[model samples]
Target: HHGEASPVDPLRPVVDASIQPLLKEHRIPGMAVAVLKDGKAHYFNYGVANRESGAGVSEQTLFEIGSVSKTLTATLGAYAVVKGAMQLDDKASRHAPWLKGSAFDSITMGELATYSAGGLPLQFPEEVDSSEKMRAYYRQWAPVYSPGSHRQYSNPSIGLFGHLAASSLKQPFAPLMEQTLLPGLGMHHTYVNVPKQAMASYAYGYSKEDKPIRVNPGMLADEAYGIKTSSADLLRFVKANIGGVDDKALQQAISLTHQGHYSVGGMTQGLGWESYAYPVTEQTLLAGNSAKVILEANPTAAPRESGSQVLFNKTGSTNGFGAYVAFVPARGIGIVMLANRNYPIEARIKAAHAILAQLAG
Candidate 1:
């Protein structure tokens, strides 16, 4: 006979049913899922932070968030805008004087943040391994489409966008994020560089081949895909975007990133987020997040009014880690999913949507 009944988590059944299958099917070694409902937070962690060490994942465990970092960079850019350090329509060359005569002469700050920078490539060339090399690459680069006409998702685009923000503010990107943005949002655990004390909690991402892996730092890594954070901290970020924070400037900066800049099919492009009409269909979310959306240029049109009800989301991954964060500000619900193994975006979307529908109701 059982001596006592352990307290049960009310959300356990649905979360378990939804996530367990994803972990098994994707071969993920560890995951941290955090949910925010009615402004409250809940966390559910699974498996190991390091398979070799056999350390179980906890709320404190850090996982690389990949291009989810872009959303943060976008926020910083928006912050620069709010602080009067930059303007969305300012020429890129104005921030980086070295780019004055380059192709960036025609690129606008908003264009870079929205992935409408006239078809900048997704990754920089192999020779662009240093900051100096990156400068040359941009200076010599040519646009495939005229600026603001097409949305082609690109790291170099947003990377330079973030660089310009830092340049405008006269601060280095890493310190600005770690010191100002992260702290402003109460995301103390998030980092562009994980500190020595927190290194033990950092999860070892596992490659598709099942080897231990982590992202390599280089030119645009910090601005593109170079943040390591816990699901708890990320969920706090989701709450901020949902309008939970009280600081006026911080709240305005957050809202600015959500302002829809352009339309591509069912999705509206924000500074760093992609959004769909709330009560969104699975089909639309999938299409908006598809490889087609990321790898190919999409035609752009003026955006519809950003309504009261909308779903804003972003998916991120490196060679090893995969992450998804989504929120509906009208419904006051959000989710953050982090895994140590790179998994398909479709699966992540479906899993989160299922949980969100139940939570929203």
Candidate 2:
């Protein structure tokens, strides 16, 4: 999967028949999609980035990637581990001493990384904003469930995982991501905080009211869902994961993030990316994130190597945008989608699954 150019021309018909209907149904204003197949990259763009100006979404356009940023945070955490900054089994409180007196003291970095720190809520209370406030919230709240006993999908869990990773690296999380990680991955234009220079290409994401918006600032913004990136950059990242990276340290770091740490049912979760055994249909992907399945415990008993045929995927959303990405390494195939206007997870899954299914054939 290394040479020819997979022209967007061939994929246009597929998009017209399958993807166009989805955008029309979801009311998505615009989108940019990139596909990597058999060593070729295809770029596709549709609709307008700005309804007022009729600005089109381009390969340079950046969209806030929501929780999909978690995968990058996880990669950084893995990078930290690889560099000897911390261990997966170490207590998170070991690095952030401010949490010494609470139940969080017992939570290991691995537990938090896996969302296995028993029952951390999906978000922190409103009072948890500033640095001091963030520390105070951790001190005041009382968690009862023992760590590693259950699963709760929440921002705070992995937010802290990333925070501690940055702490271990002795750098600010945002800078490390903006200045270090993105550049190292050759994602120069990607940003967690969109710089002034990149604003021209930034798409205005419309809300349910069709009002334009972008990501709002908050505590742990970098860790939870703060990344703004383009399909062009993400396709490079995807291509590296599908094939291999040129850098040694980064290759190993990326590999660490793909290690399956736990599972609920039909799905397995790595640091951030989730996967199903190869040959999965749409049901396997949905079942992994289903209400009945997601909240249950998926303890990682022992480690195992990921197979080339495994299907790796992630979904993301912000108030105004939605995204979905997935790939199969053995097949030399992957897909990335970025669209303005947040749509349901089902829609994201359906679109990517449809595209990937056709590619697999």
Candidate 3:
């Protein structure tokens, strides 16, 4: 399916130049791209949502967004802070009663939101399959560094961060997201749990081995890597992050997630998003999103500078899908890319950077 824009729309050429090659080179089955420039939204789509069903990808095809869900979780946590249900300085134990005597007793909610809770690994161990196991794992977990001294990207850290946010609000994570956070941002098609009727529009992600796959349900999936959404809905969420929402309180909460908490090389780590100074070079963005940044712990320090025009971004992926969202609130420009195949992050970043460069030019 083509974009909602007309055949002659200027965005077609600009987006096509960057996206078409990506789909072909990466052998992506289906993809959706949304670009918002100066507050106006445009969409571009390519290929099929399901190769077997021969379903064309459209603005509303639901894609598993993986860790991109963390941004929304961060927003939810920030909302709790703004609502007086929680505070950044609150100890993790304050929200998770089961963690009272553990290392988390000394980890702040702020650190957890920023993935600076010592050095939580990217994934939980195989034995941590159930809630009881997860609890026992956390209670016995050890830190590799002092809290707030280093930043290590980890799902378990942010998962517990979101879990505690809900605990503070006295609500379940999925309900609070579907009933409150998403609606507040005008994202009707995004969900922690895709409804049965919505399954028809949900794309089957193609795994690395070319098998159809979807996110596996497990502990902390909802709080971590478990959002399914459409380009339209995800773009709306990005626009809200760019300060487009009318609800002042909700907008404030969204902005809170963008505040720089630590500086690691050229990037500043926000609650769940990582950002760079505006007019960032593709090389710099690649470095910021590099595996080293995501997989290794980096020393954390106060942001060298703050309150500047920084480009905020987050990437997400499951075994079968790849997704990215980026925006510069100062420039009122953002892009969202969702694909059913799990391709290289470099390809995703380069394609998006090329398109944004064209538009921002």
Model 2 scores worst on lDDT over the 10 consecutive residues at 295-304
lDDT of model 2 at position 111: 86
How many collisions between residues are there in candidate 3? 0
Screening candidate 1 with a backbone cut-off below 3 angstroms (N, C-alpha, C), the clashing residue pairs are none
Q: If scored against the real structure, what TM-score would every candidate get?
A: 0.97, 0.93, 0.97
Tens-place lDDT per residue, model 2, 107-168, is 89988888888877777877787989988877776664678776777788899999999999
Alpha-carbon lDDT of model 2: 0.82
* Model 3: residues with Cα > 4 Å off, grouped in runs: 1-6
- lDDT tens per residue, model 3, 54-155: 989999999999999999999999999999999999999999888999999899999888999899999999779999999999999999999999989999
Off by over 4 Å in 2: 1-8, 291-305
> By TM-score, highest first, what's the ranking?
1, 3, 2
Superposition error at 186 for model 2 (Å): 1.6
Candidate 3 lDDT score at position 145: 94
Q: What is the C-alpha lDDT of each candidate?
A: 0.91, 0.82, 0.90
**lDDT of residue 254 for candidate 3:** 89
